[PDB]
Amino acid sequence: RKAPKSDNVYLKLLVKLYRFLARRTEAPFNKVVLRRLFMSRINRPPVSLSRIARNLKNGNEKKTVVVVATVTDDNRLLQVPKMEVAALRFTAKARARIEAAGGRTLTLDQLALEKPTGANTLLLRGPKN
Amino acid sequence: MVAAKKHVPIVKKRTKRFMRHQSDRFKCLDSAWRKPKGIDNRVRRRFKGNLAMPSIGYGSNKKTKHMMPSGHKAFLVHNVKDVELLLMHNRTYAAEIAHNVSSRKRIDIITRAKQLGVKVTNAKAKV
Amino acid sequence: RYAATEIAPTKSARARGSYLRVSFKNTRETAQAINGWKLQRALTFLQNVIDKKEAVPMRRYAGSTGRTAQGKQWGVSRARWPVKSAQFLIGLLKNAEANADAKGLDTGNLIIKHIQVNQAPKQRRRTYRAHGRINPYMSNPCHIELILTEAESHLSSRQRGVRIRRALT
Amino acid sequence: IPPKPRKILQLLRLRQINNGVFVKVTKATAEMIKIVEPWVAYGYPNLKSVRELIYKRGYGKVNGQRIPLTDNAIIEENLGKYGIICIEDLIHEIFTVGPNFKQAANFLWPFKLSNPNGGFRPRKFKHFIEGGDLGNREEHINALIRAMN
Amino acid sequence: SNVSADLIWEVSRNYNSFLVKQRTGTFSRDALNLTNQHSRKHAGFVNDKALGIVPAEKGVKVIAKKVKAANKPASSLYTVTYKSTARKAYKAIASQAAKHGYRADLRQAAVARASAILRSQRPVKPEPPKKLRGAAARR
Amino acid sequence: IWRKWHVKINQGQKRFATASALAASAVAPLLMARGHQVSTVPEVPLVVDSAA
RNA sequence: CCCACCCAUACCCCGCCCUCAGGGUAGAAACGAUGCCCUGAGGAGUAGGCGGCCGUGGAGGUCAGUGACGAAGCCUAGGGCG
RNA sequence: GGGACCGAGGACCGCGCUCUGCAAGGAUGCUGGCGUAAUGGUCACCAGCGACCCGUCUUGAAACACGGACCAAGGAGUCAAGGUUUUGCGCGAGUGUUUGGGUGUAAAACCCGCACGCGUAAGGUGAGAGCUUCGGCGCAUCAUCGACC
RNA sequence: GAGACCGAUAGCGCACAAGUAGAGUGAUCGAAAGAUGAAAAGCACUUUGAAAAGAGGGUUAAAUAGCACGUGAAAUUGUUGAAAGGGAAGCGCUUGUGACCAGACUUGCGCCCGGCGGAUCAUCCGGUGUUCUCACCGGUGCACUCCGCCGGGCUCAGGCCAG
């Protein structure tokens, strides 16, 4: 879609930022992120901390977690590993538990400034069903 | 300056208005265009010898759209401060004083527009 | 406010009448017979209509109207004698003649420059009819008004060259 | 039109009237043209007919677009890997039917011919061998191409 | 931060108190707007760096934003009045708008606005008498 | 008269909108864009002495 | 049987409108980026689907809008725009 | 050689050539009359050609049938309750202030106690978006193999 | 006491001497109808007419507000002006005739000679500001430099139709 259905002015700035990055850079990461920004909310399901903790269990540590959705909290996870997560939104419990474990929280414009190619990024989605 | 910006020639594809079907016979029917909805209507089916239906093929050229034959564009003006908005558009826009503006306020508008070079389309109304 | 506004009231004489209980159609044809006539000839004509010596030609409202030889002066065949319309038009003509006398105009040169019969608001009357209906018997009154008036280059160079040569020769 | 001749006209890219294509003669393509004989006129063109069609009405398929063949460059960007770098190689490939005929003929947009100067014939829906216009003519298609150009 | 020139444009693109639009075009009443067109380029109030030229008694009055004083409107405008030859007014405005990278894209519009103001302060010529035209109007 | 005249809005939405409105009041371009004559006042989050 | 000729909104070339499709546009001398620039193709339409604009009464904001040398309404073989 | 219709774009860039520049990525040069109803436009009328009277209903379609003297004003898919799909927003294992109470510039706005409504209390291979130190890591999810209640 | 209600075919049937006038044996049914003007100053007087009324004259800012009263549409009608019409009119494309009109144009820019009126000419020195190298102000500047005006000449660009 040419125009996002959202009326968020900050989402419009993110679409403009990632339109320039998808046009001028040959990285297919930027094209995927731009596509997911255009999708609706039911097509952007939440991703809990326990699901991304599954995906850093192997050698995927020290890689930036990128989720084009809002990251929730799981009460079933007793310990949260140190991790660097970039997302559209974070809940208060998810942001507090990541920062208590020693990690850091980024927005998608901070990810663009830090990793414009999406280098060493572990990209995730939530459960569709 | 009175002369407008240089433009391509203004072409009107059709100057005649589009008359509503059977508005000539009935006085309860205004001549404003209404699209016929009957399946057997000859205007709807585009039979020859009948009234034409408007379409996007009659659309005017984008470079000459909304231009009066002098070559300017109309801009409705209610006071002196509206004329000063046309300060940088001497070659492209013209001023049109609104119908409810009084006689004293009009004289201020023309005097300012002559200073600014802006053409007034109805400068001789209340003189 | 009269209908003919091009005629100034200073040099003219006018007289009008409203809600006159005469037939509008008979008065329209009577006013058309005397339109543009002299004042003394119109007064003589209207009295002849009363005495049934001259006839008023019926032109528009003449449906199933009888024929007479007095319409041959007008070039028609259907002509009638509206006595009631002639009586009302005499009094309005005598009124305008008195208005000219008071103003000082000459009555011998007065013509009827404007005369108009307009429709008045309709009066109502009812009569009795069978099958549950009531017959409406509306009257059609008329408004009359009359006014009396005293009777009394961008040539080219080639065109300009031909003009000079004809003038010289 | 019956359903079978309709599909062949689509497969031969004859979607419009007065539309022309170049066909390599095989046994598979000859039976295609035999069915659409009540709708087409065909024959064997010479060097002149190939030249005027390419030079005057020659357009190329570039990214799904109809680009006129006004430069030797745009031939080289599209058929340069096949060994075709200019107009004369394109004309040589159509006339002397080479291995890259399929790529060169498909690169050419179907030719939008005009109606012939001088008309067809008194009645043109009979076969050419009974005084009509439909069917196969050996070299008289060159007289038809000259009028339609 | 939360606010920027890009964000203010998104809030005020559709509706603005300076916005005037009718059919033929969309204009702006902003004093910091030069050419008086509604766009991100000429939106003086939206942009951090902007220029605006208003008439004076004799000459032009050029105002410019100071980026350090953006939250202090009483001292946010750097005002210079050029009452001199028109050539020196144009040169100083061009230097003001292009020498130090303060809106070099607006240099042409700034010089053109100073010309149009000073073209309005010259004495005006009397209009020729209107000619009666045609048979009906002349008679 | 049973036409649902009043609208139920979440309290979190109201506090979000009130917080967004307070942030826009600190923006001096947004005050001029509304129609306020803010040119002769400094420090557009205007603070006056309570003793005064 | 032969030659020439007439013309459909059909085919060919050119212009203009609209839609669709493919590209360009930031160490911003930069933009109604909801814009502009380049290129090609397409255009009948009932039921039905989608979108954008016009108009009426009332409300919040705004134009420090218009107005008794005249608001609104009305008439107009007077014009302008679409 | 003789005609007809058109001049589209608007600094340079390109492909080329008959070379002190060219006809080569779209028209310039010279001249005349007029500078006003002259071109242009709007009505009225004549002339050449074209042209069933609208709507409803039936039917494959017509035909029949019904409504229509004219004008002005009014005039017909609305509201509520309960379900359901999609889009936007807030918070998110939670969410819902507005039954009520506390303030108030008083039917607004602001704040909130205890309950209550709805929900909540483990992989491989063919793959597979994406990343890569180019050795491999591989989201969601499908085919299948799975593990458990 | 109020209203994101209605505004004289609406809103209660009733904004008015409305449950009135009127209808029915009766129970009952049940309308239509607001507005001159700020102030009646609501035509003195004269004249014609039997009268109703009309014309002068007068009141008013307005009689284009005459208690048939604010504004005053359409259907329909009259008069005047223009036109058309050998068994329908009305409509579409295209000229022509006649009537009536909107624009456009009226000169601008530059250069060169003269003649006037003035020193916001270049540089430098002091303050101020700012984008920190650009400006403003005061002085110096004194007259081959700068700015206005007038009188000539030249170039370019200027409207409509054409070759």
UniProtKB/TrEMBL annotation, chain A:
Transmembrane segments: none annotated. Residues 1-129 form the Large ribosomal subunit protein uL15/eL18 domain. One of its GO terms (biological process) is translation. The keyword rRNA processing does not apply. It comes from the Eukaryota. GO terms for molecular function: RNA binding; structural constituent of ribosome. One of its GO terms (cellular component) is cytosolic large ribosomal subunit. Keywords: Ribonucleoprotein, Ribosomal protein. Belongs to the eukaryotic ribosomal protein eL18 family. This is Ribosomal protein L18-like protein. The lineage of its organism: Eukaryota, Fungi, Dikarya, Ascomycota, Pezizomycotina. The chain holds residues 44 to 172 of 213 of the full protein.
TrEMBL record, chain C:
It comes from Chaetomium thermophilum (strain DSM 1495 / CBS 144.50 / IMI 039719). Belongs to the universal ribosomal protein uL22 family. The keyword Acetylation does not apply. InterPro entries: Ribosomal_uL22 (IPR001063), Ribosomal_uL22_CS (IPR018260), Ribosomal_uL22_euk/arc (IPR005721), Ribosomal_uL22_sf (IPR036394). Mg(2+) binds at Y128. SUPFAM superfamilies: Ribosomal protein L22. GO terms for molecular function: structural constituent of ribosome. Pfam families: Ribosomal_L22. It comes from the Eukaryota. GO terms for biological process: cytoplasmic translation. This is Large ribosomal subunit protein uL22. The lineage of its organism: Eukaryota, Fungi, Dikarya, Ascomycota, Pezizomycotina. PROSITE patterns: RIBOSOMAL_L22 (PS00464). GO terms for cellular component: cytosolic large ribosomal subunit. Keywords: Metal-binding, Ribonucleoprotein, Ribosomal protein.
From TrEMBL, chain D:
Residues 1-40 form the Large ribosomal subunit protein uL30-like ferredoxin-like fold domain. One of its GO terms (biological process) is maturation of LSU-rRNA from tricistronic rRNA transcript (SSU-rRNA, 5.8S rRNA, LSU-rRNA). Keywords: Metal-binding, Ribonucleoprotein, Ribosomal protein. The keyword Metal-binding applies. GO terms for cellular component: cytosolic large ribosomal subunit. It comes from the Eukaryota. GO terms for molecular function: RNA binding; structural constituent of ribosome. The keyword Lyase does not apply. Mg(2+) binds at P122. Belongs to the universal ribosomal protein uL30 family. This is 60S ribosomal protein l7-like protein. The lineage of its organism: Eukaryota, Fungi, Dikarya, Ascomycota, Pezizomycotina. The chain holds residues 101 to 249 of 249 of the full protein.
Automatic annotation (TrEMBL), chain F:
This is 60S ribosomal protein L4-like protein. Belongs to the universal ribosomal protein uL4 family.
